[PDB]
Design a protein around this nucleic acid. Structure first.
Lengths: 66, 88, 324, 148, 55, 177
RNA sequence: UGAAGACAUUGUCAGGUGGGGAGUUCCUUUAGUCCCUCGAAAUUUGAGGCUAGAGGAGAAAAGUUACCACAGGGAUAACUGGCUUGUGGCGGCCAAGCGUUCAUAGCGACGUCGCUUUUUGGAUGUCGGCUCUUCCUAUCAUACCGAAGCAGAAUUCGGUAAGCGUUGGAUUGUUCACCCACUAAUAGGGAACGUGGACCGUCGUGAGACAGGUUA
């Protein structure tokens, strides 16, 4: 009952910060992609195909050998 | 209506013994019944539950006798293993 | 001239100059031209029946009823068939769903056919990426004995296990190990199967990358890796057994650096190996000496398969018996 | 020189040439708002796939998929239609990423064998990143900028 | 037609129709020269004498 | 690298006896003396021979992936599950078998529940919620599940009704590819 | 004392494993040394060692997911209303101006170039069907003109124009497309789209059912 009361009295704010987080995440995503384009236009030097690792991982590894 | 496992209700010393009880939240012991005889004992109890009600006293008695033989063989094998461990 | 032909072939077909030089060395201009036309020409698709679950005439009748055009693949392969056209997709047909058959190539036929697994035998397959070879060994031995399957990668490993459970092998242990590590870890197998990773020059219709995605560096590292692979296999194999056990080497590379040279190296290193007739009807003689490099004259029995001679993937086989 | 490059690629393609559905499957499943159909373009790849139950009921319609994408190469100033290999990351929604939804700015993997770009060690590349940079739902044609 | 059938908004239909009509406009724009050539051949084939080879 | 413990193998045999009958035949000694013994790796249980377990224990825990035939995995709550990988032994020692046609088996292979028009011929004296094994016309093991009701109620029920609660089928194999 | 019989068999080590038992509280990612070792290779590479950049209470079960079913809570009572139409998108080139201080922090129309896009010519679910009144024109015909190799005839495009009239068959679940028959012609629309189930549950939870009800 305590937990339900807290959830009810919070309500809107959870959703508001949910959209705020979901937009901050997309901003970070676009910023990372822009960094990718910038660094790759400046230089690079790959193999035949994409690194088998899913993304965020290849992007930090490329930023690492930057 | 909530699960008794989640509810912190201590065990109680009714007719069914509590025996030795593990300390709460710290390293519950592991006992293996990897032995085929123990497999057969627990499986025979499971099949007893599966059969449930029977209309023949003789059939009920033979079922009970078979699973009693299961415990007897399990106990004999456990005693043999205890003797072997004492030797070693 | 030789240089003019090399430039013309490279320009018209897109091959790398170095690989084109190797292929021109391998085949005379007529045979070379036939080889290039063949390997750009798509290969046919074959179907292998699951003898454990069904038999050839029943499967053929079912696929004819469902509208699939079939033809037996020569007198050599009883378990195989060739697809011309199919109204129903091969993936969704009830026979394939239940496991009555598998899709593959004749090059997938040849190596397990070279092998002769028997009932109650211990077998190894250190490279079974599609799983068809392990499945066909299971079909030959009638689910009697033990199969060990080794893989490097989780992805082709899960594809392997999916194929195995779909075909109901029921007696294979599937693992992610190193092929070099396998002998020391377990060893002692009655039969061993190596499909060594190679340059892939055999099948560029399946892998158009090999047309260029093969440099001298790869041509140097790959034969060394398969050399260690055969070292592992010969370490694994048992010299003496109640049922005769043999090593089988199969690869999908046509370049000589991958073919006959590593097996000559293994024969020179370990005297316990002899080579026996691999038992394959159609093939080409192994070369006694190619580039100033003498090879043991016994390699005559060694067979080769080319797309231009036969509508099969470029493929290479070798069979060995262990003394001690 | 863009005309020359496009003509070379097209002539190579010409010379090379010279030399059940998920919707009906879900209908059968229903017979044997519970349905959600994705209203955004996607890419599948393999012809037939039976999706795990976590994504089984995410139907994608027949026409809205696109097999090839118009890739523009920032250098050499050439634009060519190239096949789509796979979808890697859609920043709008990880669920859209997993399904394969093609929204604006979405990076996919594209086969660049036709372009023939030479990498280090004098080596060629086949698959590279490309950022879908249009709104395919607004304009069905799917356009990407290659990442080189 | 399939895109509009699966359209979900008025702006969706807006841009889809605009894009399609743009595709046809660009196609004719490239077809600019054949129309001129065919108009000229039409004019002459109209102003062509008509004989009877059999007579 | 452990054998099962008390409650674990209790729930395992609970499911295995709900679905099969001759678990004595499963865990009974063989001619050579080798025995089929339950294994469980990464909270996933497997059925292997004792000699197989002995020759496989030499491997490190992390590097080994599969052993014998996978029976199932236990959930976080401790609930034990049997899968299409464990299908063959279930078909071998099935208690109740239900046979379906092709036009009904195709939705069954897709993942649809069994409809009355799908079944070809019926097993007798089937309890309401007892486990059963679903075969095709060719006696090919297609799947397993808990029937919605008994044979008589299935007889007197509408053809369009759901017959068996479709648990797992051949879908899992091609799911992973 | 006899027997099986060189089959079994036992012991010796070199390994590996080990959550079970006992006791305590390094590996991961990267680059170099191209130095040493082991290899390969007709002479150059591969794998380790080494170095230096960044990471880290224990078997009971846990962490976590833009995911699934279920039950519940929270939020919006609902949509558009100077909205709608005929001319695509992506990238480059060019580009008057404006801009952080100046066409270069940069924004930037019309065009052109590259992709779609090229060397031989069926889609449609509930609906409708008929009649009648009125109105709009974004005009099928009638009237009028402007242009076209428009000889004539027959036409095409453009515009002024709503007074006038604006029929069928095939086909189809049914409409249009296409197809053919008349006919000057068979044009498009508006008229508040003009008039005549969901819980109470009970039996199941790996999936559902209920002649059960409360009933709006």
């Amino acid at each position: 009952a305590r937990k339900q009361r807290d959830l009810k009295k919070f309500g809107k704010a959870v959703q508001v910060q949910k959209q705020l987080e979901r937009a901050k995440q997309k901003r970070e995503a676009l910023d990372k992609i822009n960094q990718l384009k910038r660094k790759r236009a400046e230089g690079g030097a790959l193999g035949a195909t994409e690194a088998d690792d899913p993304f965020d991982v290849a992007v930090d590894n490329e930023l690492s050998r930057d | 209506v909530y699960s008794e496992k989640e509810l912190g209700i201590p065990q109680l010393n009714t007719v069914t013994p509590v025996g030795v009880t593990k300390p709460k939240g710290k390293k519950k012991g592991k006992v293996f019944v990897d032995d085929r005889e123990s497999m057969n004992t627990i499986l025979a109890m499971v099949e007893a539950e599966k059969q449930g009600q029977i209309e023949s006293k003789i059939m009920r008695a033979r079922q009970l006798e078979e699973i009693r033989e299961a415990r007897r063989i399990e106990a004999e094998k456990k005693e043999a293993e205890r003797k072997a461990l004492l030797e070693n | 001239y030789t240089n003019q032909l090399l430039k013309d072939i490279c320009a018209y077909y897109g091959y790398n100059e170095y690989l084109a030089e190797k292929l021109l060395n391998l085949f005379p201009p007529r045979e070379a031209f036939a080889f290039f036309e063949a390997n750009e020409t798509p290969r046919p698709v074959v179907i292998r029946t699951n003898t454990l679950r069904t038999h050839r005439r029943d499967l053929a009748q079912a696929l004819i009823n469902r509208g699939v055009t079939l033809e037996p693949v020569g007198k050599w392969s009883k378990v195989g068939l060739q697809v011309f056209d199919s109204k129903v997709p091969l993936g969704a047909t009830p026979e394939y769903l239940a496991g009555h058959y598998i899709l593959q190539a004749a090059s997938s036929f040849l190596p397990v056919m070279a092998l002769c697994p028997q009932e109650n035998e211990r077998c190894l397959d250190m490279a079974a990426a599609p799983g068809g070879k392990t499945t066909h060994m299971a079909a030959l031995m009638k689910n009697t004995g033990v199969i060990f399957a080794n893989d490097p990668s989780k992805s082709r490993a899960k594809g392997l296990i999916g194929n195995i459970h779909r075909l109901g092998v029921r007696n294979t242990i599937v693992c992610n190990y190193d092929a070099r590590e396998f002998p020391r870890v377990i060893g002692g197998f009655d039969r061993v199967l190596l499909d060594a990773p190679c340059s892939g020059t055999g099948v560029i219709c399946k892998d158009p990358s090999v047309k260029t995605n093969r440099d001298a560096k790869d041509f140097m590292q790959l034969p060394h890796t398969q050399k260690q692979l055969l070292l592992a296999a010969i370490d694994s194999c048992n010299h003496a057994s109640k049922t005769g056990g043999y090593i089988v080497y199969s690869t999908c590379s046509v370049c000589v650096e991958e073919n006959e040279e590593v097996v000559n190296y293994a024969l020179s290193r370990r005297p316990n190996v002899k080579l026996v007739e691999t038992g394959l009807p159609f093939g080409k003689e192994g070369f006694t000496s190619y580039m100033g490099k003498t090879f043991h004259p016994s390699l005559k029995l060694t067979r080769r398969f080319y797309p231009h001679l036969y509508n099969v993937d470029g493929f290479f086989v070798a069979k060995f018996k262990k003394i001690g | 020189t863009a005309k020359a490059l496009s003509s070379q690629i097209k002539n190579k393609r010409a010379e090379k040439a010279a030399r059940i559905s998920e919707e009906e499957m879900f209908k059968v499943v229903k017979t044997g708002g519970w349905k959600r159909i994705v209203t955004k373009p996607t890419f599948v790849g393999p012809d037939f796939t039976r999706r795990p139950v976590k994504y089984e009921r995410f139907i994608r319609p027949m026409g809205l998929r696109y097999k090839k994408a118009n890739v523009t190469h920032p250098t050499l100033n050439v634009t060519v239609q190239l096949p789509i290999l796979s979808v890697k990351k859609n920043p709008s929604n990880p669920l859209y990423t997993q399904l394969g939804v093609l929204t604006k700015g979405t990076i996919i993997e594209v086969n660049v064998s036709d372009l023939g770009i030479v990498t280090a060690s004098g080596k060629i590349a086949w698959g590279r990143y490309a950022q879908i940079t249009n709104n395919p739902e607004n304009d069905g044609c799917v356009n990407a900028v290659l990442l080189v | 037609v399939r895109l509009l059938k699966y359209a979900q908004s008025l702006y969706q239909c807006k841009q889809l129709k605009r894009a399609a009509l743009g595709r046809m406009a660009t196609l004719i724009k490239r077809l600019k020269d054949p129309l001129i050539y065919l108009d000229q051949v039409r004019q002459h084939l109209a102003r062509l004498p008509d004989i009877n080879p059999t007579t | 690298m452990r054998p099962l413990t008390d409650q674990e193998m209790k729930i395992v045999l609970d499911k295995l006896a709900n679905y099969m009958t001759d678990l004595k035949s499963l865990i009974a000694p063989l001619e050579d003396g080798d025995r089929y013994v339950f294994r469980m790796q990464k909270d996933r249980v497997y059925y292997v021979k004792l000699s197989i377990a002995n020759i496989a224990t030499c491997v490190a825990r992390d590097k080994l992936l599969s052993l014998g035939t996978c029976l199932g995995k236990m959930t976080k709550s401790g609930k034990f599950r049997l899968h299409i990988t464990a299908l063959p032994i279930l078909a071998q020692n099935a208690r109740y078998k239900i046979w379906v046609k092709d036009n009904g088996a195709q939705p069954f292979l897709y993942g649809s529940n069994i409809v009355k028009a799908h079944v070809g011929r019926w097993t007798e004296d089937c309890p309401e919620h007892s486990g059963c094994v679903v075969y095709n016309m060719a006696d090919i093991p297609l799947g397993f599940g808990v029937t919605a009701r008994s044979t008589a109620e299935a007889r007197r029920l509408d053809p369009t009704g759901i017959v068996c609660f479709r648990q797992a089928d051949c879908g899992e194999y091609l799911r992973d590819e």
